[PDB]
Amino acid sequence: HCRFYENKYPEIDDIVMVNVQQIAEMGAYVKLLEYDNIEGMILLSELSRRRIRSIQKLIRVGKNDVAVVLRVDKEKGYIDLSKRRVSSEDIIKCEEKYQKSKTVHSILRYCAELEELYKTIAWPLSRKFGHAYEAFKLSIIDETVWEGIEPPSKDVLDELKNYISKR
Amino acid sequence: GPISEFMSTINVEHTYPAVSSLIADLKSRKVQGPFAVAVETALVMRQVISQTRWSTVDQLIDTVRAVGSTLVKAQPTEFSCGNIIRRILRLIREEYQELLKTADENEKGGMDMRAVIISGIQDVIDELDKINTDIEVQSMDHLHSNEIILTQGCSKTVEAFLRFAAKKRKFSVIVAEGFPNNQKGSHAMAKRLAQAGIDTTVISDATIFAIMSRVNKVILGTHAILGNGGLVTYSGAQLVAQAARHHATPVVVCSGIYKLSPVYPYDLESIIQLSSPDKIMSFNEGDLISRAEILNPYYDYIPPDLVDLFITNLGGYPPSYLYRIMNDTYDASDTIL
Amino acid sequence: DANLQEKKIFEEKQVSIFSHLDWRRRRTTENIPKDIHPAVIRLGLKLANYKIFGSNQRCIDLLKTFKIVIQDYQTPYGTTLSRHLTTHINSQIAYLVSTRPLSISMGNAIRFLKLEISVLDIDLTDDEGKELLLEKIDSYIRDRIIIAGQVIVQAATEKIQDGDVILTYLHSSTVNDVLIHAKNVGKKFRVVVVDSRPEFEGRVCLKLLTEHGIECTYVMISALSYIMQEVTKIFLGGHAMLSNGALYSRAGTSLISLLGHESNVPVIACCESYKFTERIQLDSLVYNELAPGDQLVNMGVDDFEEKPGVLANWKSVKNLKLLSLKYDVTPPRLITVCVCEMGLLPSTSVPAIINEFKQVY
Amino acid sequence: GEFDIVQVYKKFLQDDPEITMPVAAIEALVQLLSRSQAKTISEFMDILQNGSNTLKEGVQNNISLSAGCDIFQRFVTRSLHDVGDFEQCKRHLVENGKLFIQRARACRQRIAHLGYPLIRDGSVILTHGFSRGVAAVLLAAAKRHVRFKVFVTESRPSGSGCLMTRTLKNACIPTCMVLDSAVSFTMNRVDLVLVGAEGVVENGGLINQIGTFQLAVFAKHAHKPFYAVAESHKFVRMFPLSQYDIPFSRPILEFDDPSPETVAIHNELIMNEEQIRNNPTLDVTPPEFVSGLITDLGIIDSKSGVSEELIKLYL
């Protein structure tokens, strides 16, 4: 297990995919997977609007959903989020953006035999082309995008070049 | 908080005269019966609205309440009075809150709503002449051929309830005259029920327990329904309910909604009314009228746990759902007047 | 003809109590009109010929079929989709009702779908209109039934206590779906399975629970007095809950509740919300649905096993008639709880929940 | 700052006894909210649950306050929204908190202004045990000059009967303490029976002291009305199937297992303090035996309207 993006925490008004864990008397204890499954809370009122006299319709348990960040207290670990205020389109912009990250992490977890590899490769490369995926395919049509790459060893580094073949 | 605290009894007679004229008609029983009270209570408030001048809404809901509080103590037991009042109070603060918001909604103090209330009042008046006409149609889901039915005393609502079924289904009803106070109208009803093709039988009030053994349903019309679902009904109706429950015979109440009232039957002895003994024992028996205590009540309270079904202009509803008809029709602030 | 039949349906209000109950059933495809979709045919056959057809799966299969109808619908060029579509669908219902009367579950689905057609935005197109309400339907199957079931079972199994002795009656898929849960969550308990004539629906409940490793006990309804002394709770799945608080389920359901209350066991009603009805019934005879009388002729412990009886000529012998009602109503003073997806409510609180959904402005 | 909250709770009881356990609990959390200074809504509701469960496990997991606390959370939780300035949260939080306390303390009077008309001139009432709610309705009636008599149950094992009779006598109200075993003989004399409530249930039930259902059935058998007073902050979200389906703090009503070991008025002959602790503390009366319920929300009687109002709360 590892972290996705170099920022340990998401900033306010970011958009994060998140999996629900449980619902209590006060909110929904969710956990954001784009940041190594750290926990966060979503207020009941800030959940999607209800239509029943009494909603215990917790179909979404262990369900990956999207949300926006409201407050962050890094020194203590708490995060407050909201599901309602997410637009009906930027959600897709997250979903479109999400699985890219899931695809990238899927490659290193294979090579996990990661925090270093992000330090060596991922994030600064994403820092170069906005995001890893948005130029990760270019590593087969170009090499000058590797300007400044220093892996811990060329041992399994070139395996990537042979692993961008798959997908 | 009555009206005499606001306006002098003489100037009331000049501002809203019909109010002062109604109280006289209301205490003297010149206008009795809940319907006659209801419709006349409304159209009196019509002129009131069409005669008061004011600036803020809180003037009305404090004014129209005040006249109502006296319009109740005229004769409180005729409950349909306040029910028309209490419904009007919500009618304005709804038309208020809807307008005060739809004006706020028109954005990026007009007391000329009097004609809206009149258009809202007349709405409820037109609903009253539409009480039975939309109640009589519920019969064909309850009355069936060859069944045996029991009622008591004159009650046009129940009368129209059955005759509509008699159009196509043939069946039998049993009428217990409401002695001593519903005697006349009850007999007439049976004579009318016979014309409609209903094997109607008239019985003494005491013959009830006898025939109930072979009675399918009992239908009853009330004088009002109180905040606990209890019933204030013309005399001799408990005899029917108590005889019904003894036979597991279903009890059905066909009443309009304008009689549904939220006042809670605290003390019954302040609810029932007592008419003249002349309806029970002749004045001639002079030896008796002196040496005895003679009473003729013409109301009767039957508790709510005895009615199985309520036929209303809105539909059939169990007694354990009456409250939701209140809060959807009244406002708990206006329970007391 | 219809008015002529309506004249017949009037004269069927005679001395007999069951004069008005409709016996007219079509169990074949003879003389079917053309405007009948195939997937509707296969349904109407299943309705009139199946017997373990729960009131839930009916509403599902009805809707899933209705999608296929709408998906294949084709409005005339001189009329939009909304106009002249119920008319097509109404011509489908009139067939399905002639196979077996509409359940309460199916009915409210018709009333709902017929509504969304009306409110449908005219400024759309066909493929816009179709693709829309197919989700509305799929949503109806999601929220109103399937999820609601999963809420009930969890909400119901919470009140199951270790050491209980559960009594069900005549195979309610919902009531089966909760016992199988309570088995898998580790609850220690056992089941009594009350069955009755003529189509012994209880065996298939006994079959299911046994294949899940549940201690079960099987007795006919005539043994209620004998068997209730071991029971501590009673679980019932309804066909519908009336607005007065009564429970509208199969035949013996009334006695089950009665005999239980006179032995101080609770009657727990597991019923969804879409099976609530704005109507009310003072007796179990005004509104009901019949089964063929011949089914209780084959007196044996079977129904297909063609072994005759003494009543086989009842249709031909005067002053003799067999009947078998399929439902009866149970007074609310016998129902202890209703387990709707809004939680454990008292049965009398039904009409509010009905009026709660009427928030659809 | 302040860590222990139960002490705060424990203070208000001595600062004023005329407020009950649930009332103080609200006053504590409001203080807990105000004297706190969080940075995220998560933190705010986190210490709420901690503050609640602390008080909950503080008392013997009582119900009258565990009700009140759970309402208090799901009160302020509604209409909560973070808009620009974060302090709006804590402001709207604690501001709506004292608002709940306003409606809280004022509930005991509001019910009394609805209950006293039940008391009629010359009537006679019956009350089981001591109940501050039953007190106000009676006094406010008596304080309005109306003649009536009152029976009072001995109220074993709480013994609160000996107290309630005093609380009335100090207001010139006739009292006749009746044994727990003698309510039946009393009924034909009584015109109306009135009791308090330690908790109200989804089914319209009545969780109160051990003897309520004992005389709730007699009222039924004697056709005399049965009325109960309960404050809104006692509607609990539980559902018993029988008059016994309640959680037991202590295992109750167990039998001794012996072995061959041979070893008028008799007021001094009672069960020991050990036998009593085996007997149950509470008792639940199903709703068919209660003619009506007296709440600040009004007089409720449908026993399906208790749920609508209850559902109106917990959200």
Instruction: Answer with the one of D112, D127, D153 that is the final residue of a domain.
Output: D112
Q: Record the tokens describing residue D142, joined without a space.
A: 């008596």
- Give me the residues of C, 141-170, that contact A with CB < 8 A: 143, 147, 151, 155
Assess A76–D contact: CB distance below 8 Å, yes or no. yes
Which of A59, A65, A63 has its CA nearest to residue A21?
A63
Within 13 Å, how many C-alpha atoms sit on residue D120's CB side?
12
Q: Give me the sheet containing C240-241, strands edge to edge.
A: C240-241, C247-249, C328-330
Residue of D301, D308, D310 best to disrupt the B interface, most CBs of B under 10 A: D301
Q: Record the tokens describing residue C263, joined without a space.
A: 């032995």
Helix ranges restricted to H, C12-103 = 38-49, 55-72, 86-99
How far CA B332 is from CA of B3, B90, B329, D115, in Å, comes to 21, 10, 10, 16
Q: Spell out the domain ranges in chain C.
A: 1-151, 152-361
When computed from its CA atoms, the radius of gyration of chain B, rounded to whole angstroms, is 22
**C233-237 and C267-270: which strand pairing?**
parallel
Asked if C346 and D308 come within 8 Å (Cβ–Cβ), the reply is no
Which of D56, D200, D208 has its CA nearest to residue D130?
D208
Q: Record the tokens describing residue A56, joined without a space.
A: 């215990």
**Based on the domain organization, do D162 and D259 belong to the same domain?**
yes
Q: Map tokens 């009480």 to a residue.
A: B131
CATH value at residue A71 = 2.40.50.140
b or e along B194-214 (b: 16 or more beta carbons within 10 Å of the residue's beta carbon)?
eeeebebbbbebeebeeebee
Q: How many CB pairs under 8 A join A and D?
A: 58
Q: Please give the tally of structural domains in chain D.
A: 2
How far CA C240 is from CA of B111, C237, C271, D21, D285, in Å, comes to 50, 9, 7, 44, 29
CA–CA distance, B157 with B134 (Å, rounded to integer): 10
Amino acid at D38: A
Assess C264–D contact: CB distance below 8 Å, yes or no. yes
**Based on the domain organization, do A4 and A18 belong to the same domain?**
yes
CATH value at residue D58 = 1.20.120.1070
**Based on the domain organization, do A6 and A79 belong to the same domain?**
yes
Q: Record the tokens describing residue A39, joined without a space.
A: 């926990």
Sign of CA dihedral B67, B69, B74, B79: positive
**Based on the domain organization, do D15 and D94 belong to the same domain?**
yes
CB D29 within 8 A of CB D72: yes
**Based on the domain organization, do D256 and D151 belong to the same domain?**
yes
Instruction: Answer with the one of D52, D84, D112 that is the final residue of a domain.
Output: D112
Q: Which residue pairs, CB below 8 angstroms and at least 24 apart, start in B293-297?
A: B296/B180, B296/B181, B297/B235, B297/B272, B297/B273
Which of C144, C79, C135, C77 has its CA nearest to residue C109?
C144
Which of D53, D37, D131 has its CA nearest to residue D90?
D37
**Based on the domain organization, do A62 and A94 belong to the same domain?**
no
When computed from its CA atoms, the radius of gyration of chain D, rounded to whole angstroms, is 21
Assess A164–D contact: CB distance below 8 Å, yes or no. no
When computed from its CA atoms, the radius of gyration of chain C, rounded to whole angstroms, is 22
Asked if A53 and C151 come within 8 Å (Cβ–Cβ), the reply is no
Asked if C346 and D241 come within 8 Å (Cβ–Cβ), the reply is no
- β-partners of residue D196 are D229
Q: Which domain holds residue D236?
A: 113-313
Which of A116, A125, A119, A117 has its CA nearest to residue A148?
A125
How far CA C259 is from CA of C231, D67, D125, in Å, comes to 11, 36, 37
**Based on the domain organization, do D205 and D253 belong to the same domain?**
yes
CA–CA distance, D235 with C210 (Å, rounded to integer): 41
Which partners does chain C have (≥3 C-beta pairs < 8 Å)? A, B, D
Q: Map tokens 């409001």 to a residue.
A: D30
Instruction: Answer with the one of A44, A69, A86 that is the final residue of a domain.
Output: A86
Asked if C280 and B145 come within 8 Å (Cβ–Cβ), the reply is no
How far off is chain C from B317, nearest CA to CA, in Å? 7
By CB atoms closer than 10 A (0-12, 13-18, 19+), residue D132 is middle
Q: Record the tokens describing residue C119, joined without a space.
A: 């409110």
- β-partners of residue A64 are A19
Q: Map tokens 């059939």 to a residue.
A: B316
Asked if B145 and C14 come within 8 Å (Cβ–Cβ), the reply is yes
CA–CA distance, C335 with C245 (Å, rounded to integer): 8
Sign of CA dihedral C312, C316, C320, C324: positive
Helix ranges restricted to H, chain A = 90-111, 115-120, 122-129, 133-136, 154-163
Residues of B with CB under 8 A from a CB of C: 141-142, 144-146, 168-169, 217, 250, 252, 308-309, 315-318, 320-321, 324
Q: Please give the tally of structural domains in chain A.
A: 2
Assess D307–C contact: CB distance below 8 Å, yes or no. yes
CA–CA distance, C22 with C289 (Å, rounded to integer): 7
**Based on the domain organization, do A21 and A95 belong to the same domain?**
no
**Based on the domain organization, do D222 and D93 belong to the same domain?**
no
Which of B189, B197, B199, B184 has its CA nearest to residue B158?
B189
**B217-220 and B148-152: which strand pairing?**
parallel
**Based on the domain organization, do D158 and D22 belong to the same domain?**
no
**Based on the domain organization, do A2 and A70 belong to the same domain?**
yes
Assess C21–B contact: CB distance below 8 Å, yes or no. no
**Based on the domain organization, do D53 and D178 belong to the same domain?**
no
Instruction: Answer with the one of D93, D112, D131 that is the final residue of a domain.
Output: D112
C277 contact residues in B (CB cutoff 8 A): none
**Based on the domain organization, do A72 and A147 belong to the same domain?**
no
CA–CA distance, C353 with C340 (Å, rounded to integer): 10
Asked if A54 and C155 come within 8 Å (Cβ–Cβ), the reply is no
Q: What's the 3-state SS for chain D?
A: CCCCCHHHHHHHHHHCCCCCHHHHHHHHHHHHHHCCCCCCHHHHHHHHHHHHHHHHHHCCCCHHHHHHHHHHHHHHCCCCCCECECHHHHHHHHHHHHHHHHHHHCHHHHHHHHHHHHCCCCEEEEECCCCHHHHHHHHHHHCCCCCEEEEEECCCCCCCHHHHHHHHHCCCCCEEEECHHHHHHHHCCCCEEEEECCEECCCCCEEEECCHHHHHHHHHHCCCCEEEECCHHHECCCCCCCCCCCCCCCCCCCCCCCCCCCCCCCCCCCCCHHHHHHCCCEEEECHHHCCEEEECCEEECCCCHHHHHHHHHCC
A57 contact residues in C (CB cutoff 8 A): 143, 147, 151, 341
How far off is chain D from C347, nearest CA to CA, in Å? 8
Amino acid at C296: L
How far CA C302 is from CA of B84, B334, C51, C198, C296, in Å, comes to 64, 65, 14, 8, 10
Q: Give me the sheet containing C267-270, strands edge to edge.
A: C216-220, C191-195, C166-169, C233-237, C267-270, C337-340, C343-345
**Based on the domain organization, do A147 and A135 belong to the same domain?**
yes
Q: Map tokens 């493929």 to a residue.
A: C127
For residue A54, give the nearest of C143, C147, C343 by CB distance: C343
Q: How much of chain A is helix, strand and coil, in % rounded to 5?
A: 35, 20, 45
Q: Which domain holds residue A106?
A: 87-167
Asked if C337 and D241 come within 8 Å (Cβ–Cβ), the reply is yes
Phi, psi (deg, nearest 5) at residue A72: -140, 135
Which residues, 6 or more positions from B170, have their beta carbon under 8 angstroms from its beta carbon? B145, B146, B197, B198, B199
CA–CA distance, C141 with C60 (Å, rounded to integer): 7
**Based on the domain organization, do A159 and A124 belong to the same domain?**
yes
CATH value at residue D222 = 3.40.50.10470
**Based on the domain organization, do A122 and A138 belong to the same domain?**
yes
Assess D202–C contact: CB distance below 8 Å, yes or no. yes
Q: Which residue of C has its CA nearest to D246?
A: C159
DSSP C245: S
**Based on the domain organization, do A81 and A8 belong to the same domain?**
yes
Assess B324–D contact: CB distance below 8 Å, yes or no. yes
**Based on the domain organization, do D107 and D231 belong to the same domain?**
no
CB C310 within 8 A of CB C318: no
Q: Record the tokens describing residue C304, joined without a space.
A: 């297909």
Asked if B316 and C15 come within 8 Å (Cβ–Cβ), the reply is no
**Based on the domain organization, do A54 and A129 belong to the same domain?**
no
Which residues, 6 or more positions from A133, have their beta carbon under 8 angstroms from its beta carbon? A100, A101, A103, A104
Q: What is the DSSP string of C182-232?
A: HHHTT----EEEEE-SSS-THHHHHHHHHHTT--EEEEEGGGHHHHGGG--
